[PDB]
Amino acid sequence: GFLGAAGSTMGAASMTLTVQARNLLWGIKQLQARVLAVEHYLRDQQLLGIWGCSGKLICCTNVPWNSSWSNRNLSEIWDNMTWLQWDKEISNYTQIIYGLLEESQNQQEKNEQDLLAL
Amino acid sequence: GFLGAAGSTMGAASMTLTVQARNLLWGIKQLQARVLAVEHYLRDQQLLGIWGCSGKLICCTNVPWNSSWSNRNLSEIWDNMTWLQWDKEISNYTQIIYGLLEESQNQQEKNEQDLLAL
Amino acid sequence: GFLGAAGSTMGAASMTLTVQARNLLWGIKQLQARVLAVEHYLRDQQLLGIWGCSGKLICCTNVPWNSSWSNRNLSEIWDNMTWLQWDKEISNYTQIIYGLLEESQNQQEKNEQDLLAL
Amino acid sequence: LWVTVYYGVPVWKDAETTLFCASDHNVWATHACVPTQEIHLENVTEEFNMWKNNMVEQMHEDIISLWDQSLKPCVKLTPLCVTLQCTNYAPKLRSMMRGEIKNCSFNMTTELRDKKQKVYSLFYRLDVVQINKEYRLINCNTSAITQACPKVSFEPIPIHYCAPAGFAILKCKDKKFNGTGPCPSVSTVQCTHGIKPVVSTQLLLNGSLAEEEVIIRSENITNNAKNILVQLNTPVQINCTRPSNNTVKSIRIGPGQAFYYFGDVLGHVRMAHCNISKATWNETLGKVVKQLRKHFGNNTIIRFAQSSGGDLEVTTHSFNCGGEFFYCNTSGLFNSTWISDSLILPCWIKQIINMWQRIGQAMYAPPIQGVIRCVSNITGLILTRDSTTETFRPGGGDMRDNWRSELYKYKVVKIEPLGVAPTRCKRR
Amino acid sequence: LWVTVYYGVPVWKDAETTLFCASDHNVWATHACVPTQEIHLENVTEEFNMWKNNMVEQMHEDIISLWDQSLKPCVKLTPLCVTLQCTNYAPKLRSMMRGEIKNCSFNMTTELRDKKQKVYSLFYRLDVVQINKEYRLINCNTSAITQACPKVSFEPIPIHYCAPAGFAILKCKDKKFNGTGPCPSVSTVQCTHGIKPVVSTQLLLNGSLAEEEVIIRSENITNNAKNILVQLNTPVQINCTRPSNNTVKSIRIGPGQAFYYFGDVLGHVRMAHCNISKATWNETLGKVVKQLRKHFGNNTIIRFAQSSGGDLEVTTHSFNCGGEFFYCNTSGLFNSTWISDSLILPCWIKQIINMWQRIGQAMYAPPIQGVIRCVSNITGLILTRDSTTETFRPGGGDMRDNWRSELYKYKVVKIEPLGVAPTRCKRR
Amino acid sequence: LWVTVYYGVPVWKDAETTLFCASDHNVWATHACVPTQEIHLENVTEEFNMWKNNMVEQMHEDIISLWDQSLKPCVKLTPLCVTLQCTNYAPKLRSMMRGEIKNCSFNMTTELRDKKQKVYSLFYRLDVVQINKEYRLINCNTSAITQACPKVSFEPIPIHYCAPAGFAILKCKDKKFNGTGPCPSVSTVQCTHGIKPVVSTQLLLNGSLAEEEVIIRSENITNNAKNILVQLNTPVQINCTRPSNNTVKSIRIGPGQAFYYFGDVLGHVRMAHCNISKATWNETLGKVVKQLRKHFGNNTIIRFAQSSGGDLEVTTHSFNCGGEFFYCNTSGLFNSTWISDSLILPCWIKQIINMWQRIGQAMYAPPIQGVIRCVSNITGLILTRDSTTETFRPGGGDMRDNWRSELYKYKVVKIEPLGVAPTRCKRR
Ligand SMILES: *[C@@H]1O[C@H](CO)[C@@H](O[C@@H]2O[C@H](CO)[C@@H](O)[C@H](O)[C@H]2NC(C)=O)[C@H](O)[C@H]1NC(C)=O
Ligand SMILES: *[C@@H]1O[C@H](CO)[C@@H](O[C@@H]2O[C@H](CO)[C@@H](O)[C@H](O)[C@H]2NC(C)=O)[C@H](O)[C@H]1NC(C)=O
Ligand SMILES: *[C@@H]1O[C@H](CO)[C@@H](O[C@@H]2O[C@H](CO)[C@@H](O)[C@H](O)[C@H]2NC(C)=O)[C@H](O)[C@H]1NC(C)=O
Ligand SMILES: *[C@@H]1O[C@H](CO)[C@@H](O)[C@H](O)[C@H]1NC(C)=O
Ligand SMILES: *[C@@H]1O[C@H](CO)[C@@H](O)[C@H](O)[C@H]1NC(C)=O
Ligand SMILES: *[C@@H]1O[C@H](CO)[C@@H](O)[C@H](O)[C@H]1NC(C)=O
Ligand SMILES: *[C@@H]1O[C@H](CO)[C@@H](O)[C@H](O)[C@H]1NC(C)=O
Ligand SMILES: *[C@@H]1O[C@H](CO)[C@@H](O)[C@H](O)[C@H]1NC(C)=O
Ligand SMILES: *[C@@H]1O[C@H](CO)[C@@H](O)[C@H](O)[C@H]1NC(C)=O
Ligand SMILES: *[C@@H]1O[C@H](CO)[C@@H](O)[C@H](O)[C@H]1NC(C)=O
Ligand SMILES: *[C@@H]1O[C@H](CO)[C@@H](O)[C@H](O)[C@H]1NC(C)=O
Ligand SMILES: *[C@@H]1O[C@H](CO)[C@@H](O)[C@H](O)[C@H]1NC(C)=O
Ligand SMILES: *[C@@H]1O[C@H](CO)[C@@H](O)[C@H](O)[C@H]1NC(C)=O
Ligand SMILES: *[C@@H]1O[C@H](CO)[C@@H](O)[C@H](O)[C@H]1NC(C)=O
Ligand SMILES: *[C@@H]1O[C@H](CO)[C@@H](O)[C@H](O)[C@H]1NC(C)=O
Ligand SMILES: *[C@@H]1O[C@H](CO)[C@@H](O)[C@H](O)[C@H]1NC(C)=O
Ligand SMILES: *[C@@H]1O[C@H](CO)[C@@H](O)[C@H](O)[C@H]1NC(C)=O
Ligand SMILES: *[C@@H]1O[C@H](CO)[C@@H](O)[C@H](O)[C@H]1NC(C)=O
Ligand SMILES: *[C@@H]1O[C@H](CO)[C@@H](O)[C@H](O)[C@H]1NC(C)=O
Ligand SMILES: *[C@@H]1O[C@H](CO)[C@@H](O)[C@H](O)[C@H]1NC(C)=O
Ligand SMILES: *[C@@H]1O[C@H](CO)[C@@H](O)[C@H](O)[C@H]1NC(C)=O
Ligand SMILES: *[C@@H]1O[C@H](CO)[C@@H](O)[C@H](O)[C@H]1NC(C)=O
Ligand SMILES: *[C@@H]1O[C@H](CO)[C@@H](O)[C@H](O)[C@H]1NC(C)=O
Ligand SMILES: *[C@@H]1O[C@H](CO)[C@@H](O)[C@H](O)[C@H]1NC(C)=O
Ligand SMILES: *[C@@H]1O[C@H](CO)[C@@H](O)[C@H](O)[C@H]1NC(C)=O
Ligand SMILES: *[C@@H]1O[C@H](CO)[C@@H](O)[C@H](O)[C@H]1NC(C)=O
C-alpha cells in the first residue's frame, strides 16, 4: 500500500518504489492543485533525466560516495535505518550530490559522442 | 493521417504509431481542456516508464501471454483483426496485464543493481 | 549561467546544455503561464522521445546530413558560428529534418522487434 | 508468446469532455473564440446516438452563458416598472393592427435624483398588462428587464466546436443516417463545421439540408411525448418583414444610462408578416407525409394542425429578424389532411423577451429604426404527435432540439493509445 | 561506495497545499464537490501540531466563501431600512416573552416604483433599535441585510478534505493524543472523514467523541489568553425547541423580489429553550474537573461560571436549529464549585445574523413555518480561564476552534520520492 | 555527416507571453504579487524595438485592471447626482482662488429611506457645472462616480515583471540606446527592475535617468503625429503643495455607506502650486535643444510653447500628490525660443477623476485632511511637434508612453532548446 514501507528499512522499502511512484500523478482549487501536481512530477522527472536516470527506479551512477556526507556502513544504512531517517541525516548534502550527478552525466554524453565519431 | 489506420489490420496499423502519438499532446474551457490533456498524456507516459518502455512505441517485455486472455493465434490477431476489435475482446484483462508488467520491470531493475555490484 | 554561452561558439556552448535545460521547467496570469510552460516542455520532450532521444542532451542519429541544408564544413559550424546564427541559417529546413528523424526511429523500432522475435 | 506494448494505437472509447470554440460586437463573443483535415476511416463502423450526445448539452450551456454575458454592461431599466397611462396609438385603424400599439405616458427618472420627466412611448400590446387606462409592463411581477445594448448584434455567426488533444470528433457521412445506430462511413475531424446558433421554434431556419431524401428523426418514433425533427432535402424560402417605418427616440434615465424606445411611425401602420410559396410548402409537406407513412403505415391518414396551446413563444414561429422578435402564426401552414401564390403568416412583434424558457430574467429589446425585411431558408421542422388517422402539430421551445438538428452527425471520442498484444518478441 | 538514485522513496516533509472537497440546494455546495483506503504505518512516529495546522485555515476560508456564495442570487432587502412604528405583540403576557416580539408597521415598496404598501410584521426585539414607538433594524447603521433564500438549507453536510497527487494526509490514531507532539500510531489516508461544518459557540455539537477518556487540548495550558477545547468521551443530549407555531407571510417588494416575514402566532406565545439532563451534565463536569486537576493541581478548587461579557453571539450558546438562530443562556450549566430532572436553558431567536465575526455584511433569516424541535449531541466544550481557585467560563466565537476540534488528528505532508544512498553498484 | 540533436541550445526567438508580478492597502495589489541574477551575454547583439514591445501593452492592461479592482468594494455615491444650491466659498478673495471653491447645499439620503439630511459641502469649481445658483456634478450626464476607499493608498510601489519558465527577458545596457535597433551589449534577466506605476502627463516623474547624455526617443522623428519621449541625464526637482489646511467631514448615506467630503478650510485660502528652479530648468532645456538640433538641424530655431488645447487632463501637468489630483499649468516652462530664483506653476485640484482616457467610469477622490507637500524628480518629457523654426509643445494622456519610458530596454524572448547540426557521430 501507498507509503506502507515508510516504517520499514531502506532495503525492504526499495521493493515498493512503484507503489509510491504511481501515486505522484471548488473547481478553481482542483484546477490549481492539478497544475501544481503536474509541475512537481515533471520537476522530479527532469532531475532523473539530466542524471541519466529517466527510465529507472533504481539508478546506479559514476559519482563516488564522499564519506563526509555519511560515514555509516551499508549494513547500518540498509538494514537498520528507514528512508525517513536517512533523508533527515543527509538532507544537508542533497544539493551537493545533485550537482555532481549533473556534471557526470553530461561528461558521459560527451564521451559517447566522441566514441560514435570514430 | 490521424487515425487513418483505425480500420486497418493490427499489423499495418503498427507502422502509424507516430501519427497518433503526435496528436496526444471560452478561456476557462480552453485552460481546463489543456490541463486535462496534459494529465492524460503524462499518465500514459508514466505507465510506459514503470514498465521499462519510456522511450519506445513498440516495447517487448518478459511477461508471457496467458492463453486465457486470448486463445487466438498470431495470424488471426495481426492479419484479420483491427486494433479496435482487439481492444474490445481483451479489455477485461487490461488491468491484469498491467500489474504483471509492473512487477516484471521492478524485478529486472533489482537484478540490474545486483549485477552492477559485482 | 543561463544563456551565458549564447554568444559562444557552437562547440563551447554544447557543454552548457544542462544550464538551459534546467530553466525550461495576478493569480490567473501565473496559472496560465504555468500551464503554457508545461505544454512547451512536454512538446519538446515528445519530439525527443519519438526520435529516440528521450534521455539525452546530445543525441546522434542515423539520418545523413543533406548538403542542400548547409554546405559548410564542421570547423566553420563548430568553431566560428554560435547557435543563434546556425538556427537562423537552417531554420527553413527544421521541419524537413524532423520528419526524417521521425521516420528513422520508427523504422529502427520495427527492426528491433524483428530481431527479438528470432 | 510474449506481451508487447504498443503506444500510438488507433483506438478510442466514448467520452464526454470540454470542447472549445473556433471561428473565422456580437452576442456570441467570437473574438474570444480562437481562429479556425477530414480523414476518412475506410473500414470503421461507429454507433451514434444523437439523443445522448453531450455536444448538445455543452452547446446549450455555452449559448446561454454567452447570451447572459452580453447583457452584463447594459442598462438595467429598473425605473420602467411604473404605472403607465395608455391609449390606442391609431384609433382609426380597422386592420389587424387595431389595438396592437399603445401610446403610454409615464413619469421617468432623469440624470438627477430630484428631477422627473414626462415620457410618451409606444409599446406593443403584448408587452403591457392592464391594471386613459392603467398598464404595467409584463415583466414587472416576475423579473427585471435589462436593455440590450444597441451596439451588440444578434446575428448568428458560425461556431466550430474543436476538441482538445487526446480527443477526436467522428463525423457520420451516411446520407440516410437517422441520428442513431451504426454508421458505416465515418471520418475523423478535430473541429465540427460552423453551426450558426439560430434561435427559433417550430421551423428550423438557416440550417443544414438532407442530401438524397427528407429525414425523420425521433428518440422514439412511437412515443407521443417525444418530438420529431424533420430535415428537409431542399429549403423553403420564407420572406419576413416589419413593413412600418418606426422612429426611435432616446432619453436619459441616469448618469450614462440611456433608454431607447419606440417613438413614432412614419406613414401607414401595417402588420408584420412572412411569405411562403404555397406550391413549395405543399411539395414539402407531401415529402414529409411520404416519410411519415414509412413509420406510421401506408394506409394511415396524416393530418397537420396548428399548435394546441401554451405560451406565445411555443404556439407561434418565434425568431429574431433584423433585431426584432417576431411571433408568426403558422396555422396557415399546418392545416391539411393527407389521405392515401403566396401564403402570408401574420406576425406579432415583442420587445420584452424571456429567453431559454427561464423565469426571473428578462430582456428589453430596443427598437430598430426603419423598415425590416429578411429572407431565410426553412431547413427543417419540429413536430409533435397527438386509430386510422394521426395528427401532427408544430412544437419547439427547447433550443437543444434546434442544435440536435446540426450536431446529430458528430460524436466525441477519447483516444486510447496504449495497446497490448501477443508477439514472438522477448525482451533481452 | 557509489551514489545510487532511488525514485519512489516513502519519504515526506511538512507542507501546506490546496485541498479539495469530496462528498457523498445546500449552503455548502456539495454538488460542485466531487464524489467520495487507510494504510497503517507500523513503525512511523509523527509529530503533530493542531495549532499550526493549515487545514483549519483552509476550512475556514472555504466555509466563509461557500456561505457568501449562497447569498449572491437572493433578495437584497434594501427597502427594509425605514422607520418602523412598533408596539408590543402580546401586551397581556407576564412570561419571559413580554416585550420580546414587536408588531411593527411600515411603508414598503412594491412591484411598481410609484406605489407603496402598508405592512405589519412581527420582529424580535433583538432585531430592532428604538429611535406607537419608532424603531429601525439593528443593521441599518452598519450594513445591508440580504434575505437568505428560503430554498437553501443550512443543515451541515459532511465534507471530506482530499489531498492532490503528490501529497498525503497522515492521521493520528492515539486515543490519548492531545493535539500536539509525537504520535506513535500514524496511518496514511488521502481524504479525511466527513466533517460537518456545524457553527456554534461555547458548546461543540454533533462532532467527534474521545475514545477512552475526556481530552483537554490547549495551545498553552498555562496562558489564560488561550482557549481550552474539551473533547468528551460520551455525548450530552440537548433537546432544543421553538415551541410557538409561527405563521409566515410574504409580500412583493420589487419585480421578482419577494420578502418573507413573521406574520402571526397560532396559539400561545412561549419562550424557546433547550433541555439538558442534570445528571448527565453533572457527570460530564466531574470528568472535565478530573482532567483539569491533572493540569492545575489535585488540591486546586475548580469553579465554573457564566460568560463574563461581550456580544450575545459569544455570551450565549449560539446555534442554528431548523433554520432559526438560537441564543441560549448557559448560565445554568456553568455555575458550580468543585472542591477536592431537566435543566432548561432559555433561548432568544434572532433573524438578523452577523456571521463569522464580520462587520459590513449581514443576513436576514426568513422565518420557519410551524414549531421547531431538534435534538443534538454535545461533544465538546470551549472554555476560557480567568491562587488556590481557578475559574473556567464559556468561550467561543472564532469558528476555527470548532474546526480544530475535528482536524486535530490530521496533518498534510508532501511526498519526496527522490532519495540518494551509497551502494556497491557502479554504472557501466 | 550525420544529423545530431542537441537539447538545451542557447537560442531564442521573439515572443509575446504572459508576464507575472514580483514585489518586495495599495491600489496595485502588491500582496497578491509574489515575493521578488543578471548574466552578461559577451558576444550577443540583439535588435530591440520599444514601439512594438508587448510588455507595455501588458503593463497597461494590468494597471487598469488593478485600478478598477481597487474600487469594487467602495461606496457608489449614486445619491450625489442631485441639484446643488451653490455660492462662492470666500467672496472676499481677490487672489487666483476667487470662484475656485463653491459652498453647495443639497438634500442627501440617510441610513433610512424615509429620511433626508441637508448637507453643506465645498466643491472645486472644476467638479461642478451650472444648470443661490443651481449646479450638478460634472459626471452626472456621463457616468456614475465611485468614492475611492480612504484606506487605499495611491502611492506607486515598484512592480517587477517576471517571465515564466521557458522565456527570458533581455536587457539592453547601451547608454546611448534610443529604444530601437541593434544593441551590442545585452544581458539576460528573468525579472525587470521595479517600475513604479507613476501616472502623469507632460512631465515624467520619479523614473529612470539617462546615463552619459539626454536621449531623444521617437517612433518616427520626422512624423509630427508621433510623440517624442525625452530621457534626462539629471533630474529636475519639482516641489508641489496644496498649502491650505482642509477639514474633512463625513456623513452616512446608507447602511454602512459613508460619504467623505471637503468640510472647511482653517486659515487662509491659497492656490496650489509647484516650484521648479529656473536655472535647472533652463540648463535642462538647453540640453534638450542640443539633442533636438542633432535631428532637426544645427541652424534650426527650436521653440517651446504651451499645449495648444484639449481637455485639462492633457493641457496641464496632471499628477497625484498626497492623494489629491493636481493639474499644473506648465506654460511657464515651455515658452522660449532657442536660436543657434523659483518658477511657480499654478495648479488646480479636482476630486472627480476620469482615469485612463475612458468614458463611462469616474472616481470621486475623497479629500485629504491638512496641508499637502511632495517633492518629485522630473526625469523626462513628452513633447509633440507642430521651415526654419520648429515648435515643440507638451503632450501626454496616453499612459503607455509613460511606461514605454521604463520598458524601452527590455525585450521578451522564447527559448528554443532543440537544435540540429552535422557531426561525425553515427548511431549504433
Ligand atoms: C438567415 O440568413 C439570412 C442571410 O444570412 C439572414 O438575413 C440577413 O440578415 C442580415 C441581418 O439583419 C441582413 O443584413 C441581410 O441583408 C439579410 N439577408 C437578406 C437576404 O435579407 C436571416 O436573418 C437569417 N435568419 C435567421 C433566423 O437568423
Ligand atoms: C445535530 O444532528 C441532528 C440530527 O442530524 C440535527 O437534528 C435534525 O435536524 C434536521 C433538520 O432540521 C431535522 O429534519 C431532523 O429531524 C433533526 N433530528 C432530530 C432527531 O430532531 C441537529 O440539528 C444537529 N445540530 C446542529 C447544531 O446542526
Ligand atoms: C515621487 O517620489 C516622492 C518620494 O518617494 C514622493 O513623495 C513622497 O510621497 C509620500 C506619500 O505622500 C510622502 O509620505 C513622502 O513624504 C513624500 N516625499 C517627500 C520628500 O515629500 C512623490 O509623491 C512621488 N511622485 C509621484 C508623482 O508619485
Ligand atoms: C516494524 O518493525 C518491526 C520490527 O520491530 C518489523 O518486524 C516490521 O516489519 C516493521 N514494519 C514494517 C511495515 O516494515
Ligand atoms: C479496408 O479494407 C480493405 C479490405 O476490404 C483493405 O484493402 C483496405 O486497405 C482497408 N483500409 C484501410 C485504411 O486499412
Ligand atoms: C566572445 O568572443 C571572444 C572572442 O572575440 C571570446 O574569446 C569569448 O570567449 C566570447 N564569449 C563567450 C561567452 O563565449
Ligand atoms: C406624474 O406624476 C404626477 C404627480 O407629480 C401625476 O399627477 C401624473 O399623473 C403622473 N404622470 C403619469 C403619466 O403617471
Ligand atoms: C433509426 O434507425 C434505427 C436503426 O438503425 C431504428 O431502429 C430506429 O427506429 C430509427 N428511428 C427513426 C426515427 O428513423
Ligand atoms: C418507445 O415508446 C413506446 C411507447 O411509449 C414504448 O412502449 C417503448 O418501450 C419505447 N421504447 C424505448 C426503447 O424506450
Ligand atoms: C407578401 O406578399 C404580398 C402579396 O400577397 C406582398 O404585398 C407583400 O409585400 C409580401 N411580403 C413579403 C415580405 O414578401
Ligand atoms: C423611413 O423614414 C426615414 C425618415 O425618418 C426615411 O429616410 C427612410 O427612407 C424611410 N424608409 C422607408 C422604407 O420608407
Ligand atoms: C401620444 O399621445 C400624446 C397625447 O395625446 C401625443 O401628443 C403624442 O403625439 C402621442 N404619440 C404619438 C407617437 O403619436
Ligand atoms: C438557402 O439555400 C441555398 C441552397 O439551396 C443557398 O444557396 C442559400 O444561400 C440559402 N439561403 C440562406 C438565407 O441561407
Ligand atoms: C406611511 O407614509 C405616510 C405618508 O404618506 C405616513 O403618514 C404614514 O405614517 C407612514 N406609515 C408608516 C407605518 O410609517
Ligand atoms: C500535550 O502533550 C505535550 C507532550 O506531548 C505536552 O508538552 C503539552 O503540555 C500537552 N498539552 C495539553 C494541553 O495537554
Ligand atoms: C505559555 O504561557 C506562559 C504564561 O503566559 C509563558 O510563560 C510560556 O512561555 C508560554 N509557553 C510558550 C511555549 O509560549
Ligand atoms: C423540557 O422539559 C420541560 C419539563 O421540565 C418540558 O415541558 C419541555 O417540553 C421540554 N422541552 C424539550 C425541548 O425537551
Ligand atoms: C401549526 O399551525 C398549523 C396551521 O397553520 C397546523 O396545521 C399545525 O398542525 C400546527 N402545528 C402545531 C405543532 O401546533
Ligand atoms: C399588529 O397591529 C395591527 C394594528 O393594531 C393589527 O391589526 C395586527 O393584527 C397586529 N398584528 C398581529 C400579528 O396581531
Ligand atoms: C449522539 O451520539 C450517539 C453515539 O453515542 C449516536 O448514536 C447518535 O446518533 C448521536 N446523535 C446525533 C444527533 O448525532
Ligand atoms: C430640499 O428639499 C426641500 C423640499 O422638501 C426643498 O425645499 C429644499 O430647497 C431642498 N434643498 C436643497 C439644498 O436642494
Ligand atoms: C534610433 O536609432 C536608429 C539607428 O539604430 C535610427 O535609425 C533612428 O532614426 C533613431 N531614432 C531616434 C529617434 O533617435
Ligand atoms: C516617417 O514619417 C515620414 C513623414 O510622415 C514618412 O515619410 C516616413 O515614411 C515615415 N517612416 C516610416 C518608417 O514609417
Ligand atoms: C491644520 O489644522 C489642524 C487642526 O484641524 C492642526 O492641528 C494642524 O497643525 C494644521 N496644520 C497646519 C500645517 O497648519
Ligand atoms: C456654507 O454656507 C452656509 C450658509 O451660508 C454656512 O452656514 C456654512 O458655514 C458655509 N460653509 C462653510 C464651509 O463656510
Ligand atoms: C531624485 O534623484 C536622485 C538621484 O539623482 C535621488 O537620490 C533622489 O532620491 C530622487 N528623488 C526622488 C523623489 O525620487
From TrEMBL, chains A, B, C:
Instruction: List all disulphide bridges recorded for this chain.
Output: C53-C59
Protein topology in the membrane: Single-pass type I membrane protein
Which residues carry a glycan?
N80, N92
> Where does the UniProt annotation locate this protein?
Virion membrane; Host cell membrane; Host endosome membrane
Region Immunosuppression: start and end of each range? 29-47
Question: Which residues fall in a coiled-coil region?
Answer: 88-118
Q: Which residues cross the membrane?
A: 1-15
Domain of life, per lineage: Viruses
Can you say what this protein is called?
A: Transmembrane protein gp41
This protein's species is: Human immunodeficiency virus type 1
Q: Which gene encodes it?
A: env
